[model samples]
Target chain A: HMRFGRIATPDGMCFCSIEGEGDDVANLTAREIEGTPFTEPKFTGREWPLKDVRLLAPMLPSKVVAIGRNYADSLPPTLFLKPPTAVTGPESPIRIPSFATKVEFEGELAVVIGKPCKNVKADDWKSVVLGFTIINDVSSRDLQFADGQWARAKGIDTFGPIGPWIETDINSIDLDNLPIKARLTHDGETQLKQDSNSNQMIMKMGEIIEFITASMTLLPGDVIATGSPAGTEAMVDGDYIEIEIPGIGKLGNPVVDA
Target chain B: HMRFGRIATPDGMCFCSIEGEGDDVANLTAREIEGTPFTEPKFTGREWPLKDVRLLAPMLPSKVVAIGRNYASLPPTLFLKPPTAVTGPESPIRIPSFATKVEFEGELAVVIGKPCKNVKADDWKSVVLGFTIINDVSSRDLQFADGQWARAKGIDTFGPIGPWIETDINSIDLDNLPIKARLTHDGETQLKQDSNSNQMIMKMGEIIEFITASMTLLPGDVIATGSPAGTEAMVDGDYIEIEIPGIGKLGNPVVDA
Candidate 1:
């Protein structure tokens, strides 16, 4: 029922608890706010129309852990690391390196960790979740395969455009079958489409979260970008892309040459 | 020469600029100090004897970038270790249950001073802050099969980087007569090997340049230059000690889950 995002104003950036979505967003002054947007009493007295302010990434995580392959037919999920510096917000351009060749957009459903979780079982996964957001795992395909590790290729600046907002209600949406989709458009025409659901994911949250927390601690505000489904492709300059998760929202960005 | 590290104070934790190394350590007054030891003005007139306070990791980097294998005959191979993997001096390294074979990689760590990307060859040194020691503890079983190194090289307490930071690069001349690495386990000397940084196939500058061109390195971020030859497996109850000539020694006791 509540959407959380960082908004930019003249006084500098601050966190906001949005009452509504899209242009109908109602902004409220939140207090005693720790790091996330799940608590009910987050709203203080002050309120405003959410559309009045610009939106930024909901949170700056200590680290962004991503999964490799782990599709239904692929191998078990393996984890990777991306620096917090790589995270940019919606409307931020995805800067493609001019010196590099081959970049792709991986549309994924990103899970935001609600608290410090370690060796958590599946039955308790809900306790650790803050909410879900969208992620455009912009990567350099050539460098990815070239360097055995994906950090350099995928960890570049402006490579990870995370969200417009975080959807706090997970039970309302079907985690098992929620539609996860993406689109690649150029000059106003949509040329690429990624259509799938969380159901199609081989390693669901239970397994994914279990494996990740086993090795490292998932602190509050950390993100786990689940693996992308079939519809990923190479990106070029001026290419417009959008990642949609039906009820969650769509994350769009413009591709630019660095 | 300057050394930077975090120390346990009655007031919690404070960054310290140690006077000297070993027992003859002297404490200096430090001010306006941030997490990263290398900055514009780290020490602001604070003083104490270095041995009087307990020491911890010099820095908790945003990310620990490590090289898998870098030799003149090989390409620059690299991997990453999470910040959670880092442990300070004298801390016990907990071995993960899923990991079958555990090993320790003693390496010379390079700490970054400021944010820089797409760095030029000449500009690399400006970004360089100082040097330290790091133990790239790894799980060979997870590494060879996992397809990614996050779990293998990134388990909690797998990265031991501490003792402190050494800021005198020119005096050590890591580029040419690089300090060598030695390993002592329990009461026995298991491995003794000496190799110069100049011998690395992908030199520090080249490694820094390539990675910067890839990702933006932040202040307090670290890059483990690479583990040299002669690595050995470790077991529980083993007290691992790594010594580098010009820098210092980093020791950690091994424990199992």
Candidate 2:
């Protein structure tokens, strides 16, 4: 029974609510509550008393920042846009850009910000995050290399694909202690299944959150996908990969001819 | 009375109807219409009608492809926005960048595109225009001098000022001809006026359509700010300016603060 809940919508805002099963907030659509049933019937704790759902990218996010690589080896947080026009729902195709040569489907765990924070000390990072979710950081590698500007390259039409569900249990794991998975597949053929569960990141999550939010206010429903490990590779058409996190559900998308 | 029309919004689009005197279109938006209003106010014998209340950044561009070194003294247009995000519309306040000491202000006359056409030859430039306006191009000399790859000295918000809208005019003397201009004052506010209108590399109407056919345009507008001559200078806080062929506009923002 994947117990989920509904978040009442007022105005145009849709945030996942903590209404059903007490503090065990699960992500589900309104129909899921009327008895569609959870996918994994074997998992007793999965059903729902839900509502038309929403969550800031599945976790309360305050800021979602990114980095870039100066050379082939190093990575630095790059710039894109938080243009008000770039918002999309969970199932929306993180649009493949029309101005790209090719793109990559980065399977990574998205860190959800929980509490309101700004310039918080590094020691407080554990308390600031709510949980995690799977995010496909869709990129326009051609535009990125050609224009050399992040806003257009990273923030083009439909470039961030997030999920079908978010698990509340994601908050308990030690972010620094665990590594996530990037499992890619093409036409039912498995491609790569790698893990960064314990990979040593040059920059930690706490440092990322602090540095990111210092520039802009991170609101609820925001998401931050930290850098991927060694397996960050090019994704082509016909590729149907899923980036799955433990508590957060799978973030999936297809590579169609643009 | 100076007649002004208001554009109404529909389906998140900007448009309006223009009704006044001779030859007016009943309803159309700035986007659907070809150009804007400028000196003399009538083109090819009809009033240029329509209004876009919330004018989109005066652009419906198909190809933002700008020209490079239309001037000998001017650095390459490649020096503008391809690399970074600092550029803006004509009114942006120039922050004297780390690598810059004296970035000049080039007050220029631009042609906004209304139609689309490819410029295969110099004689083919006439079919591509709508109206014209004033644009103040800013620069950081040091940034250009230091880098090999033209760093965006122009960033997300760098290109500045463009209120002079494209308009229809019947002035035979100005039709497709370079409009004349002069700066009224120099350093200490004495007074100065000069004419270099006879020296444009590409005529207005030609620049407009040529850019369009190559860039594939929509509507609303196009841009053609030909390079400036001996652009004004600035320091901590200064106002650099320009005068177009028909009207005068200001491009003043507090300097690097």
Candidate 3:
């Protein structure tokens, strides 16, 4: 099992493998790698204490293909696209635009594609998956229903806060029963806003890959954000949100009014 | 006023300036350039007869922001097509098996010249690089069922753009430009869509203003103006040609997967 991430070092941005275990951020270290995760990146003879480096979005996806209402009473979940510009790293701020009336956060499990694929079979879905990470599928409620299309509502800049890092061990975690949770801290008081599991999904990861690739090609580094479960609420400025999935770690961001 | 395009030559893909005019392809020639059209590309001192080179899509945009229902009564709305959905002129528009009712909506397209946001409608030209043609291919069945246009219009080969970019926006009348689409099926050609840009409820400036209000448009990013009326269903083995008077024509064959 391995965890890969991109970090901002003193020299520049570089891909690295996170070492050490446990919940303490101070106990970890980031070892530099020569190439990107998509390539067979090799470790460079360098390392940094994890606390000394800043984490960036693990990968810059060419496109973010997301599913909506997968956990609802709906069959064959709806799909949406978020522009590449909407992506931001962990600890970034989810800036609520002036035009957005009600902003909400949805914690979801995101699959990173390792190869170009189309017409993927649900049984063979893992062949295309590189690994998994957590994605805060932030949305604007008013625009979502008003526009009747989720593009602008879900695609505003900084809306997609992904990754503390990517967990590349596919077989290690149980996809059906994995725990997913979100905690919101408002005015310094924290509470669990969402408690769910992958078992709630109407369609599994492989099925989603098959559905999406049927219409379009998914390229390397493309991200697929599985649907969020029931618990989602509006967020405002001065609030901090954290989405955590066991094994994948937590992705947290602050809320700010733009 | 100049026309820029990307072409597949024996050497490889290259950005070039297409010279010569009229409807005859035989009369044209392409002069190679050192850099992309977004950059101030200089001539490489090499040229190819147009027939010797195959034209690729004018620009491979990072994103294609499109407007819907801008004509025929409803207010303009926004959607997006990923870069993977884009195909160039002469390429085949492959119809997925699930898309039962495939149709083509031809419209004018705006290519951004520089990164811009919250642009005023009047200053729209300042950020625009040029204009081109786009066939907003869509699946009606999926469109009605999904409630969102993403999977309906964003399927692979759904956006067919270019022959070249017409950098001279002043020459074309945005308020009144002829837009037409021709379909060749079963070895016969028919003019299926005939309309004018004037029919559009939201003009170019307003469309740009609305889109940039929400997100930044990068250089080479394309904005597909909504389709005019007269869009009709298409079938396998059909050939589609979308033409705008000043911008030229983009033709593609339809195939089923």
Candidate 4:
């Protein structure tokens, strides 16, 4: 994501782009309409929160094609994923995969397909809109039920930890009025947590984009995650994982050791 | 698959277009050329082996992003595959999924970076240069042995079946050439129909510019699947699962409920 819907710099440094329809193409929606990214570091004016640099997978997708159990009450597109180097940005560290004794942290909300969809029609899926970021999906729950499959327990590498910013007008808000949360921190305590919304999606967002474009084709910087909200627990290797979404933001990552 | 490369007009009427390189963001090689795609059928004149009618799933990939166990002693650009879906052209009759079973067939001959190459070698897997059409990797084999995971044996309509043919580079020439596969209905036959130049794992114009560089960017009618040399016993309605490769040509689709 190092340069996607771009937008991040409150001493976090370098980030300024993202605009929809007007074809801003990362013109940085006027710094999110002139606000929010925590602005402050004009030289210690101090609001600091690009989360600590070292980042670059904020979302540099060109092929993140994914879909699984697309919520017909949660079980159909059983698809699986993770490849574009298995992504990793939010401070990158996560690995825990010793064949998964347990590891989880989903906190989704991603979705950033500016267009190219095919045969579209889930009520038009917000005109194939482009905006919104923050993914986590990181799970290895024992190689995901021991490789019964989830693309190698969710595609290892960085196990997808999405950007620190990208908000092309969040598809015009009203994601059922927002409301979601999940928090964690291990080895030092805390552990699992979850709180809901988009109204506990049993299946929303135009019925999983018309049941996954009816067949296939959803390009343009693709990234359609949106799944995970239960406390699907477990974590090791000096952990840390946070995923909050209420107007999009916060997707922490930490945990290392191969 | 209904476009890009292949224009067999021996009066057979076969056409697949969208010609190399992306149209939106601009990029075109293959000699910036055109005029090639099976034709001569307003209703056939010579009609030899033709009747696929708009089989476009062959390869219109501006992006496919596959590589899990990316073969070759495994580990280098891995790819296993899953997101499964493939009933394929021979004529439709879909609807027999519950994790469709029956597998085997790998005939690969690629090389279309006609203008796109994203480097990573084994000698660019031998410039495949062009030729892909798969059939048989469809081993739902009990959800990866009931879920041990290579990713449920790879989902995503995984029938793959050849790239829309643009090959004739002398029918896969030689070096690692071994094409002669067959599986004609029931009591299984063709137990021995071998031909070897040494068993192709790669070669055919360097498998086309290593997928046409620029970070794995091989456009202009992309197609990279060339795996199958073992079509082992596939139940659930199996018949025309043919994969002949002395160079190019592929066919498969027999899933019955």
| RMSD after CA superposition, every candidate | 3.2, 11.1, 1.5, 20.8
- Scored by CA lDDT, what does every candidate get? 0.77, 0.42, 0.89, 0.49
Please, what are the lDDT tens digits per residue for candidate 3 over residues B162-215? 988999899999778988999999999999998888988888889999998888
TM-score of chain A as modeled in candidate 4: 0.33
lDDT of 1 by residue, A1-258 (tens): 566777776556766766543433353332223334645535444544555666687889889999877566335667898778789998789888775568888888898998888999976788898888898888888877788788777888889898877888887678777887788887668965677677877777888898899888888889999887533788889888888887678788999998
Give the CAPRI rating of model 3.
medium
Is candidate 1 or 4 superior in lDDT? 1
Give the TM-scores of the predictions, in the order they appear: 0.91, 0.50, 0.97, 0.30
DockQ sort, best first: 3, 1, 2, 4
Give residue B193's error in model 2 in angstroms. Answer: 17
Per-residue lDDT of model 3, residues A1-258, tens digit only: 678899999989999999898646899999999888877778988999999999999999999999987885344589999998889999999988899978889999999999999888889999998899889999999988778788998888899999988888888779869888999999899999988889888888888999999898999889999988734878999999999998888999999998
DockQ of each: 0.68, 0.05, 0.73, 0.04
Q: In model 3, where do residues sit more than 4 Å from their true spots?
A: A73-75
lDDT of 2 by residue, A76-114 (tens): 433223222233335455545344556676665666565
Estimate candidate 2's alpha-carbon lDDT, on a 0 to 1 scale.
0.42
| Candidate achieving the largest DockQ | 3
Which candidate ranks first by TM-score, i.e. highest? Answer: 3
Q: Considering every candidate listed, which one attains the maximal lDDT? A: 3
